[PDB]
Each structure stands twice: as C-alpha cells, then as structure tokens.
Amino acid sequence: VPCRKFVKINNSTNEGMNVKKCCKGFCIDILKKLSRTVKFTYDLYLVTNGKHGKKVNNVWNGMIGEVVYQRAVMAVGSLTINEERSEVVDFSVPFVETGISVMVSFVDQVTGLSDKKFQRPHDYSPPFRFGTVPNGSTERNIRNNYPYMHQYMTRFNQRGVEDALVSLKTGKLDAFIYDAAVLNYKAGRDEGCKLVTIGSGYIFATTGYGIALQKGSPWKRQIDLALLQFVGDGEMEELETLWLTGIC
C-alpha cells in the first residue's frame, strides 16, 4: 500500500518533504482485509515524531499524540496496552497472544521474573547485563513493577533492536527484555539459532495487541465484530502461517 512520511531536509530549518513509499507486512494485511469486509476508506501514513507514545509532563507524543489530539483516527499497527493508554483512548478487542519475554544465548538458566538473577549481579560471579529499548512502555512497566530494576537498567540501556541483536550475537550483551512473538519471528529466521527464548509466557506480562480508537467512535463495534470474524475462521491462522515461521 502507499504511504507518506514528512522527512525533514536539514536540521537548521523545519521544512521537509512527504516522501511516499510502499508498505507490506502483517498489519497491512489486516487493514486490507478490513477494507475487504467493512468496505471503508483509509488514509495511511507514517509517524514523524517518534515511537508509540510517552506522557512527558501531561504531553503525549507519536501515535498517541496523533490519536488523542484527533489529527488521526486509529492505529492499525501494534501497541502495548497499560492503564493510562486505556484512560486516554478506547482499545478494541485483542487478536494475538503476545506477552513479554527475555532473549538469552536444552538447559535454561532464567526461569522467569522470579529469577535470582533479578536481585543483584554481584550474587553471580560473571557480572551480566540486560536492558530494553529507549522511550518504551516496557520501561514504564518495569518502573511500575520495580524502581530498583530501573536503577540497575539505567546503566544497562541500549539503542536499537537490531543493535541489541548484534550485541547478543557478538557478545556485547547478555540478556534482553522485549515482547514474545517478535523475538520468536526474529529467532525463527536467524542463521545459527544460537539465541534461545525463555518459556512461552508463564512468569511474564501475557498481554495482547489491540487497535486504539477514539473515545466514542462508531467504528469500534464493527471492528470488534470484524476481528472476531477474522480470527474465528482460521484466516488469522493463515496470516500467522504467512508471517511467522515456527521452527523446531
């Protein structure tokens, strides 16, 4: 599908160009099937402010700043759900079981969130390391779970998902905290398969992926019917077969 993004030219001025590009993937297939079933029109484009969303002193950003301030309508892309996001907008029903997980290098060292590694790295003889992506809702989930874990993670931060992947492959990182199915897809296509996942979402968050709509949208009931129609006939399983590769 076509898309546009307001990419700036230089850093002295704020003028830019709406570069038009192509989009494929999973949520593109979801939006195409919604356009087949519900028979509506969509205006798809990319965000230019940054990531999903973060309340910076009662000021949101990104897709939250686009939906809450009503410059857009909804987000077909994936989004984690917590308390204040459900306070500001209305989410739809979930469709996929995507919790959180920890990627490490069959034997299993970490059992889950109740690990003895999650107390002090001085307890174990190698000083290990694990972080998350910046400006993320997983950081907010940890800060609502354990502020001391945020204090240890402050010296353990990193930049990029592929950067953390290269750091795990070479040895510049020990463990990493992310979501489950995206790491499963990245490990199902990786050559060598040295990085091994932990569990299947047992001592983890075990949340879902929904579609955030505005408070009082008439499309919400139709989307809630259409998602249960798309899951309840194996077509969601067909899309999972198309966009996931379960090896071993």
Binding site: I81, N82, E83, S86, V93, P94, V96, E97, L113, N141, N144, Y202, I203, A205, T206, T207, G208, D224, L225, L228, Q229, V231, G232, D233, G234, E237
Partner: protein, 225 residues
C-alpha cells in the same frame, strides 16, 4: 478461581453480589422454539437475557455471534484448544489428521452438547463431516467425557488448554496434544451499554498489570503435584 476473581472485584469496587448457578450444564445455543418459528437462547444466556441474572462470571468463549447481541469485556484468560488422549501413533497432532477428516467407528471423538466449540465448527464450512460425526456422541458435561475416556471408551476430546493441563498435573495418564490452535481469550459475560463496564474493565486491567494473575497462578495454575 473466578470466585477469587469476584473477591478481587469486590475488594476493588464496593459492591455486594448474589452467586447462584445455571440450571443446566450448557453454555447456550441459538435454537428454534417449537412454535411460531422464533429464535431463542438458553443456558446462561437464556437466564441473563430474561433479567433473572446480572453478570455471567464464567470462562465465556468469545465469538462473533454473541458479540452482536451483548457487549464484551477484556479477556482474563488467554489459551487455545487441545486434544485429550490416554497413554504406534498415540498422538493425533490436531485437526490435520486425515483419518479424522473421514472418521469411522474407531476414532471416537466428540464434545460437550450445545457448546460454543460446536458453533465455531459450524462456522467452518469445510468440516461438516466432523459436525455430522460428533452429534451422535455429545455429552452433558465435560466430566462425563473425562469419566468416559477414563474407562478407555473415548479417543479424543477438543477442549481448552490449561484445564487439561491442570488435569494432566492431577492425573498423569491424561495427555494433551502438541498443537495450539484457536488462540483466543476468555472474559466476563456482560450486559449491554451499562455503567458496570468501564470501571470493571479498568479493575480487570489493574489485575492484569500487577502480580495478581501470578497469584492466581500460584493458587491453581503453577501448583503441580
């Protein structure tokens, strides 16, 4: 489990309650009444829509048909489907067994009578053979199927995942299958547009975000023998 969920709901929001039971062992299906060609419901939906009930606290199978009639909350349980067998191919590995596509009198498989799994298979327009086969052996409750396969009279039973995982933790001869299809969620059966929706859903999400789900796992799910 759901009684402790209701205890958590009554601890969060101050409201009293009245726990009673449904008169049968069925979820509720959309059946012709025997006069004037009219659709009616029964079971928990028939007791809810008649005004005698207020809130169905049960592992409700979320589908598209019941979403058209009532409003749904956020799911508290997230699981799939599996096959109960007893322990040559002793496993079946899901629906893709060609012997289950064209069954016979040997592979005895069925489900609970008037269940939502039968409605989900009725939407599947390419598995009418299983719909015609399982209608001769539908039982009243799932415990009847557990007792029948305990006497080695059944051979397969489509059911939710963690219930049979807990029963496999109780009895080692109960064996589940390997595949995980129909990855869905179970929530609380609700009424229409009502002020008992938003605050209750926020309380459920508050139970999701903390370790109270892990506490409920420590009560029954994580506890093994």
């Amino acid at each position: 489990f759901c009684i402790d969920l209701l205890i958590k709901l009554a601890r969060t929001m101050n409201f009293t309650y009245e726990v009673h039971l449904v008169a049968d062992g069925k979820f509720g299906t959309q059946e012709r009444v025997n006069n004037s060609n009219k659709k009616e419901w029964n079971g928990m939906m028939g007791e809810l829509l008649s005004g005698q009930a207020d809130m169905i606290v049960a592992p409700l199978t979320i589908n598209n048909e019941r979403a058209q009639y009532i409003e749904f909350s956020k799911p508290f349980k997230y699981q799939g489907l599996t096959i109960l067998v007893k322990k040559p191919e002793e496993r079946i590995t899901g629906i893709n067994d060609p012997r289950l596509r064209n069954p016979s009198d040997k592979f005895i498989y069925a489900t609970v009578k008037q269940s939502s799994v039968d409605i989900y298979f009725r939407r599947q327009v390419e598995l009418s053979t299983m719909y015609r086969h399982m209608e001769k052996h539908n039982y009243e409750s799932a415990a009847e199927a557990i007792q029948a396969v305990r006497d080695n009279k059944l051979h397969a039973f489509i059911w939710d995942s963690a219930v049979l995982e807990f029963e496999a933790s109780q009895k080692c001869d109960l064996v589940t299958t390997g595949e995980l299809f129909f990855r869905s969620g179970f929530g609380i059966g609700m009424r229409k547009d009502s002020p008992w929706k938003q605050n209750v859903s926020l309380s459920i999400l508050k139970s999701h975000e903390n370790g109270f789900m892990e506490d409920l796992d420590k009560t029954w799910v994580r506890y093994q023998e």
